[PDB]
Every structure is written in C-alpha cells, then in structure tokens.
Symmetry: C3
Subunit: 52 residues, 3 copies
C-alpha cells in the first residue's frame, strides 16, 4: 500500500508555505523600507520648502 499522491501533495503544501512565509517577510520589510524612503524624500523637500 501507498499514499503517494497525498504524500506529494503534503510536501508541495509545506514547500509552498515556506515560500509564502519568506515572501511575506520580504514584502513587509520592503514596505518598511519604501515608507522610510518616502519619508526621507518628503523631508528633503520639506527642508527646501522651509528654506524658501
């Protein structure tokens, strides 16, 4: 006896979850960086406004 299709489906789901976990953490990091860069750019323009 063998449960091969189910075993392979389970391995595929575990692999997919590892990939998706890593993508989530990468994406959240990228969001933080992107907002920090937006704030840095805004601050540069703010300093120029204030110096007008």
């Amino acid at each position: 006896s063998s449960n091969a299709k189910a075993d392979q489906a389970s391995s595929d789901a575990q692999t997919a979850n590892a990939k998706a976990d890593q993508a989530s953490n990468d994406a959240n990091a990228a969001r933080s960086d992107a907002q920090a860069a937006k704030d840095d750019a805004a601050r540069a323009n703010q300093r120029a406004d204030n110096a007008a």
Copy 2:
C-alpha cells in the same frame, strides 16, 4: 484520506499567506516608486535653484 485533507488545508494556508505577500509587495513597489519620484523632485529643485 486524512493526509490528503490536511494537504488541502495547508495549501489554503499557503494561498492566504502568498496573497497577503503579493498585496504587500505591490504596495511596497508603489511606495518605492513614489519615493523615487519625490527624491528626484528634491534634486531638480536643487539643480535649478538660484
């Protein structure tokens, strides 16, 4: 088939996480592009200043 059922559940878990990751990555791209445009504006103001 208990293993197949659990594999199905775990695949839905993976989809929920991948969908959230995609949403967040799309927002990060849009914000980073906005940051590039705004930073270019500050440098253009500098280039063209009196």
Copy 3:
C-alpha cells in the same frame, strides 16, 4: 485521488504567487534604496549651496 490532486494544484498556485511576491519585494527594496540615496544627495546639495 481528487482531493490530493486539488491540494497539489492549490499548493503550486501559492508557490508561484509567493515567488512573484518575493521578486516584487526585491524590486521595491531596490527602488527604495535608490530613493533613499537620492534624498541624501538632495540634502547634501542643499547644504553645500546654503
């Protein structure tokens, strides 16, 4: 084997969406770094001219 086959297909979908989300996240990280560096150029130029 319908259930296992469905779980496998759903897992493949999640896996592919996760790969694209990781690529998009890197693209945003790259753009954010460029914007960060350009904002620092802008400030530098402004302080040198002030």
